């Protein structure tokens, strides 16, 4: 069964960028719920239950028809937020191979950020914006609700190994930014953990 | 050209059920934005810009994929919220023809409320919960993002004429309820304008 992962920090660690009140609720309420609903659905699926959530979401089509939707939403939700927590930290600097790779595939860090911001801002409704690695090339893609590029094109409309990502569901930014999602996206640049992204990139490049 | 309609009441007229701060932000920011993005899209579509928003959304299939998407989301947003504002009011009582029709298609008002609450709660991500009239039968359905049953089955995955509806995007309840969407849904019963719902049921158009 899945468990709510402990965070790499206290809820107020991303202040004054991401509000601690949201961090706590996002963690203990929203993320906990994805874990509970996922476990409920996995109760009658012993073989699928052993898999780490990241591997499960890559096999949604092998699940019984009546299990696909509930797990797609909740396993996706568990996997996305687990990655999200580790993908946040103050004081990091984009550098090394990840910086060079971005400049290589996007032309420059600026083209990258502008493209990411647009993807993040144009995602209508609930969803995520991602920086993924497709084989040997990085790209910016977005998914609806709790879908993940790890689920593949057929299901999520996107694909690739997620290096980093931004949650754009309104619950991730409403208490502090309300409708102003663009300001929330700007703040994200102050808390995206480039060291973790660099770590994931070194493992997959 | 569409315009942001004025509310039938003050921002605090729905309290202590729906908070005034949300009422204002939801109206002057969210709805206002759908109106603006919708007009920008219709600015290069004269043959369509003169149609009432409710009618435009039934003809989305007559638009190129690009305009279709932007209008589906924003014309839909404009139509749904214009209906929402008029569909809210305190001190009304479910009665007469509409109440008899509900008990008839659902068994009783409580059975109806329970089915509506389930539909509203189960709508994963952003979307709406509706009470629609399909021919001569009432039904409960939900749509994603700003989709409307007026768009037809193929586009929204639902159909029928909207009688009443509840917006379950998180921006509609996060400031006061945060993650507790169910408490928000329960409060809805105190502000749903049954007089206007009864009027729409009588007109059937
Ligand atoms: Fe989230
Ligand atoms: Fe809304
Ligand atoms: O989310
Ligand atoms: O809205
Ligand atoms: O909405």
Swiss-Prot record, chains A, B:
GO terms for biological process: cellular response to selenium ion; removal of superoxide radicals; response to acidic pH; response to heat; response to oxidative stress; superoxide metabolic process. InterPro entries: Mn/Fe_SOD, Mn/Fe_SOD_BS, Mn/Fe_SOD_C, Mn/Fe_SOD_N, Mn/Fe_SOD_N_sf, SOD_C_sf. Keywords: Manganese, Metal-binding, Oxidoreductase. It holds the Pfam family Sod_Fe_N. Binds 1 Mn(2+) ion per subunit. It comes from the Bacteria. GO terms for molecular function: antioxidant activity; DNA binding; manganese ion binding; metal ion binding; protein homodimerization activity; superoxide dismutase activity. Mn(2+) binds at residues 26, 81, 167, 171. GO terms for cellular component: cytoplasm; cytosol. It catalyses: 2 superoxide + 2 H(+) = H2O2 + O2. Its EC number is 1.15.1.1. Its cofactor is Mn(2+). Belongs to the iron/manganese superoxide dismutase family. Homodimer. NCBIfam families: PRK10925.1 (NF008177). Destroys superoxide anion radicals which are normally produced within the cells and which are toxic to biological systems. This is Superoxide dismutase [Mn]. It comes from Escherichia coli (strain K12). The gene is sodA.
